[PDB]
C-alpha cells in the first residue's frame, strides 16, 4: 500500500521545461506502472503517459508525444515527468499515479490502465507573467444596500501571481458564512479572487472586520481593515 | 536406402540454422510481444535499449509439424542407425524427400513432443569431454507430462524415476562405468534455463524442474507421491530465446490453458569438476533452441544435386 509524494509547484515560462518528481514509497517500486495525469484549472484528467518503470519503457499520449517524458529512479524510488517547450495551456495540476502490477520483480505483469494511488498533485504554471504579491481592497458592507438583518461585505484580493491564495477573516475567526470565490484569470496574466461574509449590521462598527489574505510564492501576508466605512 | 558412404555432422547441420531461422519468423507474426526490448551498441561501452511496442493479440499458439523438402538442384540424405552419434561417417544413409513432420517446440530442459530412440536411450554431444557442451539425451521411450496455466505440471513419479536410471546408465557407459552419476538442478542463469521453461497456448511457463533433477545413484523420492508435481508459473516479461533482449506479453485470458506433451528428450550438461574422483554431476540445459532442432535433425543433411 504506498504512498505517492510529489515535487513542489513550480512557475515556468513559455517555452521553457519543467520537471516534477514523484517518490514512491510503501511497497516495492518496480512492482508499480505510474502514470502521469494532468488536469488544466476548470479542465479535467488528460491522460499524460505511463511508465511500465521495471522495464523503463514509458508510452505518451498523441498530443504530447516530443514535448514529455517519463523516466523513474529505481535508486531513489522517484519517477519524473518532464515537459519541454511549455505553453500556457500546459499550465495545470500535474498528477503522478500508480498502480500495482503484480510479482513484476519475478516476470509477472498486469499492465494495468487505471490509477489505484494517486499523488498529491503537483501545479505548474506556464505563463509570461512575474510573481507578484496582492493588494487587498475592502468591499464596503452595504449599509445604503441591505439592513434589518445581516449585511455582506469582503475583500477583494487583485492582481496576484502564480496561486494559489488563502483567505480568512478576523485572524482566522469569522471564516463561518464565508464565501471565497476561486481566482480569475485577468487578460494581464494575473489573477483575482473575492472573499465576502454576510454578517449582521449591526455588528459593524465593533468588530473590525479583517480578512486575512497570504500569497507564500510572493512571501506577501496581507491584512485589510474592512471599515463599514 | 542410398548405397554410398557419406560424412555428418548433426552440430555443424545447415538445416539446424535453416530452421531455427524459420521458427523464428514462425514467431514474430504468431507472438509478438507488448513491447520487445534489445540491446542497442555502437561498441562503445554504453548500450541504449531499443524499444518496440507492437499490438499484443492473445492467440493460442498451437505449433503445426513442419515439413523440410528439398526443392531442385538439392536433395536430402537421411541416416540410418539404432545408435547415430550424428556426428560422422553414415553407412545406411539414404535419400529422402522430406523430413519426418516435425513440431517446432521452443522449451528448455526438456524436450517435448520430438522424436523418440527406435532401438534404446542415446545421447549425443559435440564433445562428452567438454563439460561445456551440451548433452542432448534421446528418450527411446517418453514420459508423459502436463501441464496447466493453473499453476503447475504433473509427471509419473515412477517413469521418471525410470527414466533418470536409463538414463544415467546411459551417461556412465560413455564417461566410466566406475564413476557414479549424480542428477542436480540448474546451476544458476536465467529464468528460462534455471526451469523447464516452454510455451503452452502462447503463455509461457516456466516450471521448476527442481523434483526432475535432483536424482542421487542412491536413494529415492516416491514416499507419499504417486506423481511428481512442477510447480510451474507463467511470466509476461521474458527474455527471448530468438535474440538477447526482454518481452512482455500480455497477461493469460482464456478460461483455461493446458499441455500434455511426451517428454521425449533432455539437454543435459555435466559439470567440468576438474577430473575430481567419479562423480560426474548432470545439470538441465538448454537454452540454446538449436540444440533442440538438431536433436530432431542429427540425421539429416541437404546437399546440392550432382
Ligand atoms: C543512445 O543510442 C543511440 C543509438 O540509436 C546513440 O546514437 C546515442 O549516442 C546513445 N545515447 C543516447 C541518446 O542515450
Ligand atoms: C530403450 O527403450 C526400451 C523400451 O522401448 C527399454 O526396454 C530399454 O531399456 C531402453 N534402453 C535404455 C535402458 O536406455
Ligand atoms: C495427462 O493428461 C492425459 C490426457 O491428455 C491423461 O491421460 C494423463 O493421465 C495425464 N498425465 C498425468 C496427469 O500424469
Ligand atoms: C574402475 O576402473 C577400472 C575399469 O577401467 C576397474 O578395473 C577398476 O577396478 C575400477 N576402479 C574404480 C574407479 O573403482
Ligand atoms: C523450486 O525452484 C527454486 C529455484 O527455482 C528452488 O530454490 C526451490 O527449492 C524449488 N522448490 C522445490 C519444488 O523443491
Ligand atoms: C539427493 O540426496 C540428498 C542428500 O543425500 C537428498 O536431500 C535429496 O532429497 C536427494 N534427492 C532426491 C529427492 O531423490
Ligand atoms: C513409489 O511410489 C510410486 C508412485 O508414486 C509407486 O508406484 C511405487 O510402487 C512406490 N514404490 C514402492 C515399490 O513402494
Ligand atoms: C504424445 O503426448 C500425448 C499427450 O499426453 C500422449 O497422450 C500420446 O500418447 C503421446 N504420443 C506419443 C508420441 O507416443
Ligand atoms: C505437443 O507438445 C506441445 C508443447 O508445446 C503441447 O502443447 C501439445 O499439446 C502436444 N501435443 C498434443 C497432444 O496436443
Ligand atoms: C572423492 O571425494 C572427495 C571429493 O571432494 C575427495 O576429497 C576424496 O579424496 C575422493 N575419494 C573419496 C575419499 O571418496
Ligand atoms: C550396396 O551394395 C552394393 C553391392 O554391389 C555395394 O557396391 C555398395 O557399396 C553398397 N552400399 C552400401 C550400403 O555401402
Ligand atoms: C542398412 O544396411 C545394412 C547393411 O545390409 C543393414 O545391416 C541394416 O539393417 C540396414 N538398415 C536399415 C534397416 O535401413
Known amino acids: 500500500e504506498v504512498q505517492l509524494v510529489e515535487s513542489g509547484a513550480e512557475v515556468k515560462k513559455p517555452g521553457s521545461s519543467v520537471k516534477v518528481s514523484c517518490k514512491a514509497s510503501?511497497?516495492?517500486?518496480?512492482?508499480?506502472?505510474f502514470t502521469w495525469v494532468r488536469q488544466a484549472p476548470g479542465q479535467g484528467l488528460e491522460w499524460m503517459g505511463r511508465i511500465i518503470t521495471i522495464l523503463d519503457v514509458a508510452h505518451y499520449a498523441p498530443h504530447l508525444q516530443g514535448r514529455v517524458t517519463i523516466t523513474a529512479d529505481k535508486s531513489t524510488s522517484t519517477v519524473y515527468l518532464e515537459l519541454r517547450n511549455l505553453r500556457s495551456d500546459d499550465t495545470a495540476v500535474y498528477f503522478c499515479a500508480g498502480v500495482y502490477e503484480g510479482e513484476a520483480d519475478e516476470g509477472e505483469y498486469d499492465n494495468n490502465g487505471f490509477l489505484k494511488h494517486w499523488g498529491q498533485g503537483t501545479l505548474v504554471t506556464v505563463s509570461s507573467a512575474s510573481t507578484k504579491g496582492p493588494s487587498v481592497f475592502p468591499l464596503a458592507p452595504s449599509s445604503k444596500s441591505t439592513s434589518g438583518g445581516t449585511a455582506a461585505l469582503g475583500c477583494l484580493v487583485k492582481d496576484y501571481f502564480p496561486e494559489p491564495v488563502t483567505v480568512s477573516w478576523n485572524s482566522g475567526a469569522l471564516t463561518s458564512g464565508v464565501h471565497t470565490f476561486p481566482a480569475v484569470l485577468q487578460s494581464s496574466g494575473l489573477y483575482s479572487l473575492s472573499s465576502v461574509v454576510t454578517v449582521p449590521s449591526s455588528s459593524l462598527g465593533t468588530q473590525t472586520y479583517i480578512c486575512n489574505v497570504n500569497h507564500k510564492p510572493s512571501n506577501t501576508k496581507v491584512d485589510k481593515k474592512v471599515e463599514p466605512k | 536406402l542410398e548405397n554410398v558412404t557419406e560424412n555428418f555432422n548433426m552440430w555443424k547441420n545447415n538445416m539446424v540454422e535453416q530452421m531455427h531461422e524459420d521458427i523464428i519468423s514462425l514467431w514474430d507474426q504468431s507472438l509478438k510481444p507488448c513491447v520487445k526490448l534489445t540491446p542497442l551498441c555502437v561498441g562503445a561501452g554504453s548500450c541504449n535499449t531499443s524499444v518496440i511496442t507492437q499490438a499484443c493479440p492473445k492467440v493460442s499458439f498451437e505449433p503445426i509439424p513442419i515439413h523440410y523438402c528439398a526443392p531442385a538442384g538439392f536433395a536430402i540424405l537421411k541416416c540410418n542407425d539404432k545408435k547415430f552419434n550424428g556426428t560422422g561417417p553414415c553407412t545406411n544413409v539414404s535419400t529422402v524427400q522430406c523430413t519426418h513432420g516435425i513440431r517446432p517446440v521452443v522449451s528448455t530442459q526438456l524436450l517435448l513432443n520430438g522424436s523418440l530412440a527406435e532401438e534404446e536411450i542415446v545421447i549425443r554431444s559435440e564433445n562428452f569431454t567438454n563439460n561445456a557442451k551440451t548433452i542432448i539425451v534421446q528418450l527411446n521411450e517418453s514420459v508423459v507430462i502436463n501441464c496447466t496455466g493453473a499453476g503447475h505440471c504433473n509427471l509419473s513419479k515412477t517413469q521418471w524415476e525410470n527414466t533418470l536410471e536409463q538414463i544415467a546408465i546411459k551417461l556412465k557407459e560413455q564417461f566410466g562405468n566406475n564413476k557414479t552419476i549424480i542428477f542436480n538442478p540448474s546451476s544458476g542463469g536465467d529464468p528460462e534455463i534455471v526451469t523447464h521453461s516452454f510455451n503452452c497456448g502462447g503463455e509461457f511457463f516456466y516450471c521448476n524442474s527442481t523434483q526432475l533433477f535432483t536424482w542421487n545413484d542412491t536413494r529415492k523420492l516416491n514416499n507419499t507421491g504417486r506423481n511428481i508435481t512442477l510447480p510451474c508459473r507463467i511470466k509476461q516479461i521474458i527474455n527471448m530465446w530468438q535474440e538477447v533482449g526482454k518481452a512482455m506479453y500480455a497477461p493469460p485470458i482464456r478460461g483455461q490453458i493446458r499441455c500434455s506433451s511426451n517428454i521425449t528428450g533432455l539437454l543435459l550438461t555435466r559439470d567440468g569438476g576438474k577430473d575430481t574422483n567419479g562423480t560426474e554431476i548432470f545439470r538441465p540445459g538448454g537454452g540454446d533452441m538449436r540444440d533442440n532442432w538438431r536433436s530432431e535433425l542429427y540425421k539429416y543433411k541437404v546437399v546440392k544435386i550432382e
Open positions: 510503501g511497497d516495492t517500486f518496480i512492482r508499480y506502472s
